Amino acid sequence: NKPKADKSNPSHIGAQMPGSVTEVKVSVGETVKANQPLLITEAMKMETTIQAPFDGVIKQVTVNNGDTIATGDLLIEIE
Amino acid sequence: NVHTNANVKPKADKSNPSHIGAQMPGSVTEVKVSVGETVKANQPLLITEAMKMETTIQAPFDGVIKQVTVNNGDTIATGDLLIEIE
Amino acid sequence: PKGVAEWVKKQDDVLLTDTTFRDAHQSLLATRVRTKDMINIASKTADVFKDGFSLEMWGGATFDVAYNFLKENPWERLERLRKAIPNVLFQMLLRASNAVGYKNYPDNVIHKFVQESAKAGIDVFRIFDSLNWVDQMKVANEAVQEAGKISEGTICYTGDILNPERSNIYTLEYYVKLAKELEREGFHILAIKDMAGLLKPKAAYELIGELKSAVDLPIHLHTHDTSGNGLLTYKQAIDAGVDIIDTAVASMSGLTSQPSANSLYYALNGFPRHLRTDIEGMESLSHYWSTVRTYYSDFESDIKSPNTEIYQHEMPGGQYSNLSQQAKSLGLGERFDEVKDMYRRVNFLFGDIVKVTPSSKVVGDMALYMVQNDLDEQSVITDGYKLDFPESVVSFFKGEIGQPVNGFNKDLQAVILKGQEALTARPGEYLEPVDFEKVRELLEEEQQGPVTEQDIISYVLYPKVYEQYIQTRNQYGNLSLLDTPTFFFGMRNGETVEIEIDKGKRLIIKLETISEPDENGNRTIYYAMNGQARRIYIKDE
Amino acid sequence: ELEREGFHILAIKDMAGLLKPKAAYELIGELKSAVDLPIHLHTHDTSGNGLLTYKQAIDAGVDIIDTAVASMSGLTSQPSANSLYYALNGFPRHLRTDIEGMESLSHYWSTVRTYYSDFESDIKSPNTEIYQHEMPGGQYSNLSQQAKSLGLGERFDEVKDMYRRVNFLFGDIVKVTPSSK
Amino acid sequence: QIKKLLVANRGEIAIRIFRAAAELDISTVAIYSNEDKSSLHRYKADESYLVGSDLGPAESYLNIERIIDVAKQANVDAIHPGYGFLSENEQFARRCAEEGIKFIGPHLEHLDMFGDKVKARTTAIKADLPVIPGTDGPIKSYELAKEFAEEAGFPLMIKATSRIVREESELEDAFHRAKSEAEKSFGNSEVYIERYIDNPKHIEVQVIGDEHGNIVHLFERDCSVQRRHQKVVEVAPSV
Ligand SMILES: Nc1ncnc2c1ncn2[C@@H]1O[C@H](COP(=O)(O)OP(=O)(O)OP(=O)(O)O)[C@@H](O)[C@H]1O
Ligand SMILES: *C(=O)CCCC[C@@H]1SC[C@@H]2NC(=O)N[C@@H]21
Ligand SMILES: [Mn+2]
Numbered sequence A: 001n002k003p004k005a006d007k008s009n010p011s012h013i014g015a016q017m018p019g020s021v022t023e024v025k026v027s028v029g030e031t032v033k034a035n036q037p038l039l040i041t042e043a044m045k046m047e048t049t050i051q052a053p054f055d056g057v058i059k060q061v062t063v064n065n066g067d068t069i070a071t072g073d074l075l076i077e078i079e
Numbered sequence B: 001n002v003h004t005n006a007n008v009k010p011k012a013d014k015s016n017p018s019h020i021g022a023q024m025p026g027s028v029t030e031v032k033v034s035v036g037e038t039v040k041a042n043q044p045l046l047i048t049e050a051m052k053m054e055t056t057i058q059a060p061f062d063g064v065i066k067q068v069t070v071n072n073g074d075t076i077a078t079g080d081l082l083i084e085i086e
Numbered sequence C: 001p002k003g004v005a006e007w008v009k010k011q012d013d014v015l016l017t018d019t020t021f022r023d024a025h026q027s028l029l030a031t032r033v034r035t036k037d038m039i040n041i042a043s044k045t046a047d048v049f050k051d052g053f054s055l056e057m058w059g060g061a062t063f064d065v066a067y068n069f070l071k072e073n074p075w076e077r078l079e080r081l082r083k084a085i086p087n088v089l090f091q092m093l094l095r096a097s098n099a100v101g102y103k104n105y106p107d108n109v110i111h112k113f114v115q116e117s118a119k120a121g122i123d124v125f126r127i128f129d130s131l132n133w134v135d136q137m138k139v140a141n142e143a144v145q146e147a148g149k150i151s152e153g154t155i156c157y158t159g160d161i162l163n164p165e166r167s168n169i170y171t172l173e174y175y176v177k178l179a180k181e182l183e184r185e186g187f188h189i190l191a192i193k194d195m196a197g198l199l200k201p202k203a204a205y206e207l208i209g210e211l212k213s214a215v216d217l218p219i220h221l222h223t224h225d226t227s228g229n230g231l232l233t234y235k236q237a238i239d240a241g242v243d244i245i246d247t248a249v250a251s252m253s254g255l256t257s258q259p260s261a262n263s264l265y266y267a268l269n270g271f272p273r274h275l276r277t278d279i280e281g282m283e284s285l286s287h288y289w290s291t292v293r294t295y296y297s298d299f300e301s302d303i304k305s306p307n308t309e310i311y312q313h314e315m316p317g318g319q320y321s322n323l324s325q326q327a328k329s330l331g332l333g334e335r336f337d338e339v340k341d342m343y344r345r346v347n348f349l350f351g352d353i354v355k356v357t358p359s360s361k362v363v364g365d366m367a368l369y370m371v372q373n374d375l376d377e378q379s380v381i382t383d384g385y386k387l388d389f390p391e392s393v394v395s396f397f398k399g400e401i402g403q404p405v406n407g408f409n410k411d412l413q414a415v416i417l418k419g420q421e422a423l424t425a426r427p428g429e430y431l432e433p434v435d436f437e438k439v440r441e442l443l444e445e446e447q448q449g450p451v452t453e454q455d456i457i458s459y460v461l462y463p464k465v466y467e468q469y470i471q472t473r474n475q476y477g478n479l480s481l482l483d484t485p486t487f488f489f490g491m492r493n494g495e496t497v498e499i500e501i502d503k504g505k506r507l508i509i510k511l512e513t514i515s516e517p518d519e520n521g522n523r524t525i526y527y528a529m530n531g532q533a534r535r536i537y538i539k540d541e
Numbered sequence D: 001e002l003e004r005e006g007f008h009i010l011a012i013k014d015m016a017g018l019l020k021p022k023a024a025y026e027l028i029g030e031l032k033s034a035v036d037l038p039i040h041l042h043t044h045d046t047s048g049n050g051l052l053t054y055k056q057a058i059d060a061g062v063d064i065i066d067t068a069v070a071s072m073s074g075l076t077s078q079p080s081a082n083s084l085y086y087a088l089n090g091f092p093r094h095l096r097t098d099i100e101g102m103e104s105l106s107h108y109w110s111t112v113r114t115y116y117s118d119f120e121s122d123i124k125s126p127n128t129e130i131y132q133h134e135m136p137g138g139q140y141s142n143l144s145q146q147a148k149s150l151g152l153g154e155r156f157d158e159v160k161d162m163y164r165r166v167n168f169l170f171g172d173i174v175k176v177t178p179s180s181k
Numbered sequence E: 001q002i003k004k005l006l007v008a009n010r011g012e013i014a015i016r017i018f019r020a021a022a023e024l025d026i027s028t029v030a031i032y033s034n035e036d037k038s039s040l041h042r043y044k045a046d047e048s049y050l051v052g053s054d055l056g057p058a059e060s061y062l063n064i065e066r067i068i069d070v071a072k073q074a075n076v077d078a079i080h081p082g083y084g085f086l087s088e089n090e091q092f093a094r095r096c097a098e099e100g101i102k103f104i105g106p107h108l109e110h111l112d113m114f115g116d117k118v119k120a121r122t123t124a125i126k127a128d129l130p131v132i133p134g135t136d137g138p139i140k141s142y143e144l145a146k147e148f149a150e151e152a153g154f155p156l157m158i159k160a161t162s163r164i165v166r167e168e169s170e171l172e173d174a175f176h177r178a179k180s181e182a183e184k185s186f187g188n189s190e191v192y193i194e195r196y197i198d199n200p201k202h203i204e205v206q207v208i209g210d211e212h213g214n215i216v217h218l219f220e221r222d223c224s225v226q227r228r229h230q231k232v233v234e235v236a237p238s239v
């Protein structure tokens, strides 16, 4: 008495702000084009809106409406 | 209780010369005066141990001890009432 | 306003502008000093500074902080201090077209804000643009003139004019042209905002001297004491003929704050110009703020000695304790020295720019973001094509914060914004005028009754923050009136507290005990309010 | 008298930091004139005017000044060597020392100082009462603690007054150790 | 013409007055001493003020000038003195009028008239009411007892201008302290003597007059249940 996203080869999207999620804009299975805002996360006087790295079809969203996330966390995976 | 270490002391009212307050977090090592006593100015009335260091608490004037809020081996906190004099 | 400027020139004494109510605590205590504490010594302050030029007691970070963290209305701080201090001019720091926020707003917003600020009691508006771009200051200036109040136009200092190798942009010549430009716009007073305490003593002499014979405007010098040379800078400033300086009371002075008024008063003993003020009384103020400061130990910065390395990273003094709190909340507590090393790096990455609010905020956001992800400068030369940046840092390369003298590097910029792109004009002239009528309606709906002009631009300046303040007010009433220790810590068993509500009206609350959490996590607090048994049940979190 | 006694250097110990800027300019100028001894000025930045005082002393022709590294400086300590170094930029006389090293030393002491937090003083600010009462170094802290110990916590603005008066009762004396006690 | 009202008193009477005033939509002000920090009457008025940290609980409700000061600062139209502090004090009622404040009570002349137990007796005689046979004035010089006793009646009583005597050398030895016990509580060493009526029934009449010449009685109160000097039980009407 959250898994961490990979930051080398596999094209996941890792958290770069250690704060909270404000808005989830993408669904479990969705078509998404270049630079489409998919995640809106908030810190103290900061705000990162997560863009798309390339194009692809989003196969998973690992964050809900109002979740605390750490640096380098699994949020999206795209191919 | 089994000793008197759970006992909560009232806070000394700072703008009253009768009230003597604890200056630091310490331990009461030796009580030297009781309720209803009269000794000169500078009388060593209480012996605290701050942190391995020892200071006697002295009376600011002449007068009669109305209350002693502590017993031997009692813990104290900053601003705790210890003694009242007249 | 015209006349007040003329009167300042005739004055041979040095005129003092106190910053205890605004910039001193913005520098030292992450801006958290509450109204209650100011309102308590307002009468004494009114006397001590009866001869001062102004009191800087509004604007800057206080608008955000009051509504946000302190859950108190900054408008109420203003009006109350106004009524309490009718003799001395009130000064507030205004961020050109960013007003009291972090990007540019539509011009009708800045206009409305100044109209309400002036109406509610502000007298001197210190306008400044974080890129020293005069075009951005015109709107604010026009609004201030129209209000019949004093317009102070600022140049923000960077680099070292004593050092040609530091920069061939920010030269003595740079400042003279910029001052002369501010004179034609009809600003009443010229201000030198040395935000990062970069103005070396010799440089201030050389700088004020040139300006003093380049323009007729009275010169208001503002610096921070971060180097430890603040007093020297002022003494030299005074020798070259400066008209007003910004000082703080001894116990709210030094390090990241401004130099000590108290120390200065004596510094000029035996010298030609002395300081126009009451020392016996400033000691009183110092003793007061000495204790009050104690209430805010939780907000004290890391620094406790003068720092000469500030000549390297150029972090603004009024950013220092606020960005120490941001880093702390962001997992970067302890690691703040690495946050300062790259704040220097970020600066040269952007081509040596002016760093004040909000341009400092962007360098600050770029510093916090790169240090979190272990990112270097060369990690963007060909590798920027993906990263995902903070809103402020992309906003800067879109030009929502203006245009820096030296622009940006095309290739440097592109990799950050790709999608849409750069806008070249000062945002005010394309951004459409905000509908204040629709805003009136919206607030008239959520709340159901009387809503003021202050409410309206407050909400336009700060949507989420304002809304949340209203949420809190509905729940907990007016918190301004609680003393600070009670505001931060609540109450101790057997403690009694007086809350002053109005003249002859007070709340006598005694907390008897708190019960154990019942089978719902609800504890019972036994109170006694104004001689009346009372029970309050609180969810234990 | 001291030159005549065969001392090699004249030193001025300003233990209370009373030597104001102009006064230091005035004092050291006349002292350069009067004696052939080099002058070695020592002071405490307890008023906040330490550096300025040093800048004037330098202007009047002082040979040596006492300093401390930034992170061990200011308030009741000595004026910061790092600060003064940059303060003097553009003026006729410079400080014979190494910046890059002062910073490196400062950083060292910055961390080492933390080992001693239990022994820090309660002085957080410059204090200008000193120009009235003249209490050397951190003596207004000791006496404040001692007056609390004698139930005179609220009447300290009267202990400051009496101290100043006692000095005149003893015929105006220098107050260092142990004349200050 | 009384918008705001101050009570120069404490306890139940301050509370009662506050209630009366509240019902007339009249704004109220209380005063409290240091020892009264937590007396209930303090919380029943619209406003309250500490008389000040300068005088103790003793002289806190008796300090004429600092009560007027509080009243001026609060914009008070009238002061109700309740009972048993400044309620019979000519000086306080005078100072009130001198400051544009209505003293809730009779005129200065009535307070002087009845504030003295010789003047009051003179007044009663002048109004043709049966008075207790005694000295047509005061007695200050010595042998004072040995100059009324042997020419009046059997049981006597010496009262100060605010001690039972049954004669025989105890006319002075049991009187000794009627010069100094009228010095700790009251400020009058001046005294007078009355024929002590044994076995009396104490009856008082309630009277109310307006400022237009209208006067009425609200019948009598039997105050005969008393222990020594103190009243204990009252009844109305008398049975
Ligand atoms: N002549 C008298 N004979 C007998 N008893 C008397 C006489 N005068 C007064 N007393 C007693 O004292 C009481 C009232 O007189 P006292 O001297 O106490 O006046 P007081 O205390 O000023 O009254 P109050 O408190 O109502 O103003 C009576 O109830 C009675 O018991
Ligand atoms: C949170 O709302 C507190 C404000 C922190 C940001 C402040 S605004 C002024 C300082 N300059 C800057 O760029 N950031 C600091
Ligand atoms: Mn500033």
Ligand SMILES: [Mn+2]
Pocket (backbone or CB within 6 Å): D014, D015, D042, D043, D044
């Ligand atoms: Mn020394």
